[PDB]
């Protein structure tokens, strides 16, 4: 029920460019309650309780998981561009971390070709698109922190203070071929639209990395566990390739 309410709030606020402070407060309270709920669930199954694990596997948890992933996939990129929503984005990332932990706990104590593992695979193939968006959002920002050491962009840096013009920074991406054309515009938007075309790639590529490091590591661990415990899974290898 909480997931449905949050999805309705997302669908209402999708059109608006800037989230009102009251909506931010309501989102914060809702995500705090959701974070508390997950922790309780993890506690129920953290100890390898097979009966509780089976009861959760045969439940409506997966639909709520899919809905939460769908909400998250748009929340991250909607709140990234703005500069007044960093706290809300960080709280969202913490909530997403908890979601993964609960899933890992669910995955705790599995066997090869397990029923719970197959259920998780079916969940992933049902919600493939949002997972792909999340994975892309993580990887291009990792490559964003990688671009600081690139000579093909450092030479394009002209400002003595270290600032890089907008057009020059577009050309640098295009030369390095790290990010494709449609992704170029998203990176431009998320960049700190500085008063000059000169932009502080330093902060633009150094932010969103601490809060994303933990959740990215958890996602990698989950994918590795599923890949190792489910042999002969072409969809899973597709996710690994992505």
């Amino acid at each position: 029920r909480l997931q449905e309410s949050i999805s309705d709030f997302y669908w209402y606020y999708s059109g608006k460019d800037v989230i009102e402070e009251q909506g931010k407060r309501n989102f914060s309270k809702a995500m705090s309650v959701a974070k508390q709920v997950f922790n309780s669930l993890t506690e129920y199954i953290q100890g390898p309780c097979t009966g509780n694990q089976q009861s959760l596997a045969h439940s409506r948890l997966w639909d709520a998981v899919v809905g939460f992933l769908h909400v998250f996939a748009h929340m991250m990129m909607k709140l990234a561009q703005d500069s007044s929503q960093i706290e809300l984005l960080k709280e969202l990332l913490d909530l997403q971390k908890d979601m993964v932990v609960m899933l890992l706990s669910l995955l705790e104590g599995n066997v090869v070709n397990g029923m719970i593992a197959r259920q998780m695979v079916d969940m992933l193939v049902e919600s493939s698109s949002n997972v792909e968006m999340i994975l892309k959002f993580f990887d291009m920002f990792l490559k964003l922190k990688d671009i600081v050491g690139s000579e093909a962009f450092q030479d394009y840096v002209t400002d003595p203070r270290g600032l890089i013009s907008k057009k020059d920074f577009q050309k640098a991406m295009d030369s390095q071929k790290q990010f494709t054309g449609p992704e170029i515009q998203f990176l431009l938007s998320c960049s700190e639209a500085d008063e000059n075309e000169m932009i502080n790639f330093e902060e633009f590529a150094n932010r969103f990395q601490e809060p994303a490091r933990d959740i990215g590591f958890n996602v990698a661990v989950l994918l590795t566990n599923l890949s190792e415990h489910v042999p002969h899974d072409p969809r899973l290898r597709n996710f690994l390739e992505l």
Binding site: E4, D8, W11
Partner: protein, 221 residues
């Protein structure tokens, strides 16, 4: 216990249960030369086979109310209660909609349901509700389950009017249960399926059971 999903053909049969017969009539419309829908009886198939070529509706799109409003302002999906759906006639390629004309003089509030050739507007979008007490909103629907459909454009139901002794379907304020029976769901790839048109051929270049030409002495018999 299968759940209805998009890209599927349904008959949308309504069980009249008139005179304890349970005819389970189904809506149909030609689409060319006539837009209004009407119920044809699917019962008594042994004595006379009822036509079903004009009784197939494909589930084109499924969406929630809020998302529907947003796109109006602007790959199988499981169908669940409180969701908007789009129905496309198989033969006519048009969309089922709720027309503003009211040919029924018995009820002033009644509205006629028909086919429209455009997907624009909210007149062609419909929402199912959990008519059963056990079911509730937000739950995925399943085959063999009665449903109640309401126009998103105007609150109304596919009421089965029978005041004049003839069963008609119209948008009214009275509730009516509808059975969403799927057909042609299990695609036999490379195999011959029901409700299919084809040219039988003893061998090759045969024209098997090809009727005689027009205005022939055979009378096409």
């Amino acid at each position: 216990v299968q759940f209805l999903r998009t890209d599927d053909e349904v008959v949308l049969q309504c069980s009249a249960t008139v005179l304890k017969e349970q005819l389970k009539l189904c809506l149909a419309a030609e689409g060319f030369g006539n837009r209004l829908c009407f119920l044809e009886p699917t019962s008594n198939a042994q004595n006379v086979p009822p036509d079903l070529a004009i009784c197939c509706f494909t589930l084109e799109q499924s969406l929630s109310v809020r998302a529907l409003q947003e796109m109006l302002a602007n790959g199988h999906r499981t169908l669940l209660y409180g969701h908007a759906i789009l129905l496309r006639h198989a033969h006519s390629r048009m969309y089922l909609s709720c027309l503003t004309t009211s040919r029924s003089m018995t009820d002033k509030l009644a509205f006629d349901v028909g086919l429209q050739e455009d997907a624009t507007g909210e007149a062609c979008w419909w929402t199912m509700h959990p008519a059963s007490k056990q079911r509730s909103e937000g739950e995925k629907v399943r085959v063999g389950d009665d449903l109640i459909l309401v126009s998103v454009s105007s609150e109304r139901y596919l009421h089965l009017s029978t005041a004049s002794g003839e069963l008609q379907v119209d948008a009214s304020f009275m509730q009516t249960l509808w059975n969403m029976n799927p057909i042609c769901s299990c695609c036999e790839e490379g195999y011959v399926t029901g409700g299919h048109v084809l040219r039988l051929f003893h061998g090759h270049m045969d024209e098997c059971l090809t009727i005689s030409a027009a205005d022939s002495d055979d009378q096409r018999r």
